[PDB]
Design an enzyme around this catalytic site. Structure first.
Site, PDB file in Angstrom:
ATOM      1  N   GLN A   1      28.922  41.186  31.407  1.00  0.00           N
ATOM      2  CA  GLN A   1      27.473  41.307  31.504  1.00  0.00           C
ATOM      3  C   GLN A   1      26.756  40.617  30.356  1.00  0.00           C
ATOM      4  O   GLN A   1      25.546  40.384  30.455  1.00  0.00           O
ATOM      5  CB  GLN A   1      27.042  42.773  31.597  1.00  0.00           C
ATOM      6  CG  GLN A   1      27.409  43.607  30.376  1.00  0.00           C
ATOM      7  CD  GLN A   1      27.222  45.089  30.602  1.00  0.00           C
ATOM      8  OE1 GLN A   1      27.641  45.636  31.622  1.00  0.00           O
ATOM      9  NE2 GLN A   1      26.645  45.800  29.643  1.00  0.00           N
TER      10      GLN A   1
ATOM     11  N   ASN B   1      30.531  44.993  36.420  1.00  0.00           N
ATOM     12  CA  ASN B   1      29.105  45.094  36.743  1.00  0.00           C
ATOM     13  C   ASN B   1      28.239  44.939  35.500  1.00  0.00           C
ATOM     14  O   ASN B   1      28.703  44.743  34.368  1.00  0.00           O
ATOM     15  CB  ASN B   1      28.796  46.329  37.560  1.00  0.00           C
ATOM     16  CG  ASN B   1      28.753  47.659  36.871  1.00  0.00           C
ATOM     17  OD1 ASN B   1      28.326  48.669  37.467  1.00  0.00           O
ATOM     18  ND2 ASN B   1      29.235  47.735  35.647  1.00  0.00           N
TER      19      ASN B   1
ATOM     20  N   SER C   1      33.260  46.594  26.076  1.00  0.00           N
ATOM     21  CA  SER C   1      33.062  46.948  27.469  1.00  0.00           C
ATOM     22  C   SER C   1      32.003  46.107  28.168  1.00  0.00           C
ATOM     23  O   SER C   1      31.597  46.442  29.293  1.00  0.00           O
ATOM     24  CB  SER C   1      32.676  48.434  27.561  1.00  0.00           C
ATOM     25  OG  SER C   1      31.637  48.739  26.631  1.00  0.00           O
TER      26      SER C   1
HETATM   27  C1  LIG Z   1      38.937  48.725  32.699  1.00  0.00           C
HETATM   28  C2  LIG Z   1      37.952  47.741  32.232  1.00  0.00           C
HETATM   29  C3  LIG Z   1      36.640  47.631  32.732  1.00  0.00           C
HETATM   30  C4  LIG Z   1      35.571  46.646  32.391  1.00  0.00           C
HETATM   31  N1  LIG Z   1      34.382  46.643  33.153  1.00  0.00           N
HETATM   32  C5  LIG Z   1      33.489  45.743  32.649  1.00  0.00           C
HETATM   33  C6  LIG Z   1      32.281  45.640  33.318  1.00  0.00           C
HETATM   34  O1  LIG Z   1      31.954  46.349  34.421  1.00  0.00           O
HETATM   35  N2  LIG Z   1      31.352  44.791  32.731  1.00  0.00           N
HETATM   36  C7  LIG Z   1      31.541  44.035  31.551  1.00  0.00           C
HETATM   37  O2  LIG Z   1      30.584  43.338  31.212  1.00  0.00           O
HETATM   38  N3  LIG Z   1      32.820  44.099  31.043  1.00  0.00           N
HETATM   39  C8  LIG Z   1      33.740  45.026  31.479  1.00  0.00           C
HETATM   40  N4  LIG Z   1      34.912  45.058  30.759  1.00  0.00           N
HETATM   41  C9  LIG Z   1      34.989  44.384  29.559  1.00  0.00           C
HETATM   42  C10 LIG Z   1      35.462  42.950  29.681  1.00  0.00           C
HETATM   43  O3  LIG Z   1      36.770  43.001  30.461  1.00  0.00           O
HETATM   44  C11 LIG Z   1      35.690  42.326  28.406  1.00  0.00           C
HETATM   45  O4  LIG Z   1      34.865  42.486  27.417  1.00  0.00           O
HETATM   46  C12 LIG Z   1      35.848  40.793  28.477  1.00  0.00           C
HETATM   47  O5  LIG Z   1      36.846  40.536  29.451  1.00  0.00           O
HETATM   48  C13 LIG Z   1      36.188  40.116  27.149  1.00  0.00           C
HETATM   49  O6  LIG Z   1      36.382  38.723  27.425  1.00  0.00           O
HETATM   50  P1  LIG Z   1      36.914  37.814  26.244  1.00  0.00           P
HETATM   51  O7  LIG Z   1      36.874  36.490  26.817  1.00  0.00           O
HETATM   52  O8  LIG Z   1      36.241  38.101  25.003  1.00  0.00           O
HETATM   53  O9  LIG Z   1      38.415  38.334  25.987  1.00  0.00           O
HETATM   54  P2  LIG Z   1      39.782  38.202  26.831  1.00  0.00           P
HETATM   55  O10 LIG Z   1      39.515  38.297  28.329  1.00  0.00           O
HETATM   56  O11 LIG Z   1      40.658  39.265  26.249  1.00  0.00           O
HETATM   57  O12 LIG Z   1      40.359  36.758  26.599  1.00  0.00           O
HETATM   58  C14 LIG Z   1      40.891  36.438  25.258  1.00  0.00           C
HETATM   59  C15 LIG Z   1      41.489  35.031  25.571  1.00  0.00           C
HETATM   60  O13 LIG Z   1      42.031  34.560  24.282  1.00  0.00           O
HETATM   61  C16 LIG Z   1      43.416  34.210  24.478  1.00  0.00           C
HETATM   62  N5  LIG Z   1      44.137  34.417  23.218  1.00  0.00           N
HETATM   63  C17 LIG Z   1      44.201  35.707  22.512  1.00  0.00           C
HETATM   64  N6  LIG Z   1      44.951  35.366  21.424  1.00  0.00           N
HETATM   65  C18 LIG Z   1      45.420  34.100  21.457  1.00  0.00           C
HETATM   66  C19 LIG Z   1      46.218  33.287  20.719  1.00  0.00           C
HETATM   67  N7  LIG Z   1      46.773  33.734  19.567  1.00  0.00           N
HETATM   68  N8  LIG Z   1      46.468  31.985  21.013  1.00  0.00           N
HETATM   69  C20 LIG Z   1      45.863  31.501  22.174  1.00  0.00           C
HETATM   70  N9  LIG Z   1      45.058  32.239  23.045  1.00  0.00           N
HETATM   71  C21 LIG Z   1      44.905  33.538  22.568  1.00  0.00           C
HETATM   72  C22 LIG Z   1      43.694  35.176  25.607  1.00  0.00           C
HETATM   73  O14 LIG Z   1      44.938  34.782  25.982  1.00  0.00           O
HETATM   74  C23 LIG Z   1      42.749  34.915  26.559  1.00  0.00           C
HETATM   75  O15 LIG Z   1      42.651  33.591  27.162  1.00  0.00           O
HETATM   76  C24 LIG Z   1      35.943  46.004  31.297  1.00  0.00           C
HETATM   77  C25 LIG Z   1      37.155  45.843  30.692  1.00  0.00           C
HETATM   78  C26 LIG Z   1      38.066  46.794  31.223  1.00  0.00           C
HETATM   79  C27 LIG Z   1      39.469  46.886  30.560  1.00  0.00           C
END
Ligand SMILES: Cc1cc2nc3c(=O)[nH]c(=O)nc-3n(C[C@H](O)[C@H](O)[C@H](O)COP(=O)(O)OP(=O)(O)OC[C@H]3O[C@@H](n4cnc5c(N)ncnc54)[C@H](O)[C@@H]3O)c2cc1C
Ligand SMILES: Cc1cc2nc3c(=O)[nH]c(=O)nc-3n(C[C@H](O)[C@H](O)[C@H](O)COP(=O)(O)OP(=O)(O)OC[C@H]3O[C@@H](n4cnc5c(N)ncnc54)[C@H](O)[C@@H]3O)c2cc1C
Lengths: 363, 363
Positions: free
Chosen positions: B341, B56, B337
């Protein structure tokens, strides 16, 4: 109207233990299906331990402390001897093992197993340490699992990727499951084993013709090891972070490991210097350990699970009636730092349990 | 002799941030290739954060503390409003937010964004707490990523599974890489960001028609939240384990979360009791956070890396000469977190950086 197998089993987990268990079962004529998140092709996955091992044969316990471990190790050594001619295991001749004191040498229990076992002079040991030398064996951990999987294929076993959250998901087409899920045993409803714990292991994979293995536990502030594996590579370790789940590479740990390994054997480098070490990869794996030691035993369980059996059971906490069956769960997990070197013997014990459960419960 | 794109970029990472960044870039006419270990189909993988979110829209910072965060949040809210008619976002009307004190309400900065923002009477708050209510939005986290991926497909983006250990592996067919690797940023040579840290989040996924969202930060000993998502399910949280990498389900945490959520809203249960909660899954994800806050900036880097640039560089520490190129690395990680959003606004900033780097460095 075909005659169908009455010997179906599911093996939950495809690390070295599940694969080994599956293979002995397949050889015994069971129809084996392997369900696992992580399969042998997943050679860089940190969500299981088997890709990350040395993997050599280095007993860690005395007979009294680890009677099963020693049995399993002795059997596995025999199996690995058999695999040398086809290159699936490799001799590590003149392996050097250092310990802080005589106690650390575990009563020399394995001295009839590893050829050419003898004490090392202190001149050949780190200062203040004690040592022995012997010939042991190693396997290339990911390729060894892949070898087991090919053997399994030929014997009719099948594989399927699945991540189970509750036991009834594993009891799919079989009334007996071998539970070889390592750390996963803690979070599957119906297993819920709080005693499962990681022991974190960071290593450096190095390109080197070095064929000498050195196992140094003589410095409690710095675990170190050099394990050559088939293919012109050596694994330099290490760490034993009990309860540590951290999957990231610690750069200070890199420096400590390489400096220590270089002290132990300069030939891991091109020029005997740190800067001369040809680094291939920085690795972190979580060893799947268990307080109380490895669990290898058969359990009888009623399905469906209820919230009284498991805090993690699915559905509403109000549970009963619909439908009920009793099944066999054969545990095989928590092998910590010794899963490869125990694998074949552990698998033998698992297969015996399956045979016995089949006699008692499955016709 | 065909006219080829001069706008190739690689996006490293396929969580919500990499996907969002990739999509805005694809819409801008860049030729995008996504390299990632974990892809949108990997809906139960714990090696990335994006499967596990609510997800959310709940701001966590004041404007002064988080100016970028607020900008990114405000933009993303507008995008999610646009996605309601096609069901990719859902209104959470009359969301209730509780805090320990007025300070915890962050200056009410977002009160012009979420419709129907107003204070709650104390009768409508947990004892001793303060509260506001407003209408906000949520998305179904895994399905939202899958939606972005379909949009990407249509715009010509391609995907490839790869796990990178050193930057030169990402600079594959492009001179600009968007680094959206979450926690992975710490262990890739050439990035080596020690400031990346997990913040562990355990949840319970529940089957319930409850459409009311409650965000309770009024009890420092018990974080709790109830987040309905498209599809008749609610996510019950939670934890904020800073620096905790533990992927196992804590059974005590289950009890605490469900008891607290039940206090907040009995309708998450069939009969207002714990035993009446229809549990679908126990989840643990690691939020990818970063001390110093999210990193969204463009870096110029010379390849190949040497051991002076990175403690984790591959090969021998003696490095030079062969061959050398300078490339652009656009960081986008550490959203903690608030990655969903903030995603659209963060992606807008990433795309602006790419445009500017293209002007300055890539013709
Ligand atoms: C319980 C829980 C509740 C949440 N609720 C919310 C919410 O209500 N609202 C909100 O805004 N967010 C929420 N979040 C936060 C949100 O899930 C994260 O901040 C967000 O998913 C981060 O996205 P990202 O793309 O940065 O990272 P990630 O989703 O971690 O993706 C990282 C990517 O990089 C790849 N990668 C990592 N290292 C390598 C490598 N060496 N070589 C190749 N690929 C690699 C991964 O495999 C993946 O594709 C929550 C998270 C959790 C755990
Ligand atoms: C750095 C390092 C060095 C090592 N060196 C050695 C060595 O020299 N010698 C030695 O003997 N050992 C060594 N080990 C130890 C060895 O790696 C392990 O003990 C062994 O790999 C354990 O195998 P396993 O099959 O029990 O577990 P794992 O390899 O962890 O496999 C568990 C399996 O269960 C699956 N699974 C888990 N949960 C679920 C689920 N919920 N649903 C479906 N599937 C699930 C996994 O995906 C996977 O298929 C080392 C380990 C490390 C990290």
């Amino acid at each position: 109207l075909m005659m169908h197998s009455q010997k179906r089993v599911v093996v939950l987990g495809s690390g070295v233990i599940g694969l080994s268990s599956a293979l002995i079962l397949a050889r015994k004529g069971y129809s084996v299906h392997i369900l696992a998140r992580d399969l042998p092709e997943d050679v860089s996955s940190q969500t299981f331990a088997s890709p990350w091992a040395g993997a050599n044969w280095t007993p860690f316990m005395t007979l009294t402390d680890g009677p099963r471990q020693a049995k399993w190790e002795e059997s596995t050594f025999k199996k690995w001897v058999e695999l040398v001619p086809t290159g699936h295991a490799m001799w590590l001749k003149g392996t050097r093992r250092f310990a802080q004191n005589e106690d650390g040498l575990l009563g020399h229990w394995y001295k009839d197993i590893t050829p050419n076992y003898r004490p090392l002079p202190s001149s050949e040991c780190p200062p203040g340490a004690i040592g022995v030398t012997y010939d042991t064996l190693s396997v290339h951990a990911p390729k060894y699992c892949q070898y087991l999987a090919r053997e399994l294929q030929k014997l009719g076993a099948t594989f399927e990727r699945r991540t189970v959250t509750s036991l009834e998901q594993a009891f799919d087409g079989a009334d007996l499951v071998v539970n070889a899920t390592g750390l996963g045993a803690k979070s599957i409803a119906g297993i819920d084993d709080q005693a499962a714990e990681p022991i974190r292991g960071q290593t450096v994979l190095v390109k080197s013709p070095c064929k000498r293995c050195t196992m140094d536990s003589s410095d409690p502030a710095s675990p170190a090891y050099i394990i050559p594996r088939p293919g012109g590579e050596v694994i330099c370790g290490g760490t034993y972070g009990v309860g540590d789940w951290d999957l990231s590479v610690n750069p200070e740990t890199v420096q400590r490991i390489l400096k220590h390994c270089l002290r132990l054997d300069p030939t891991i480098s091109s020029d005997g210097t740190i800067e001369g070490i040809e680094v291939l990869r920085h690795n972190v794996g979580l060893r799947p350990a268990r307080r109380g030691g490895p669990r290898v035993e058969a359990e009888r369980i009623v399905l469906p699970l209820d919230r009284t059996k498991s805090p993690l059971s699915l559905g509403r906490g109000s549970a009963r009636a619909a439908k009920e069956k009793e099944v066999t769960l054969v545990h095989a997990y928590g092998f910590s730092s010794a899963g490869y070197q125990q694998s074949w013997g552990a698998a033998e014990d698992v297969a015996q349990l399956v045979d016995e459960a089949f006699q008692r419960y499955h016709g």
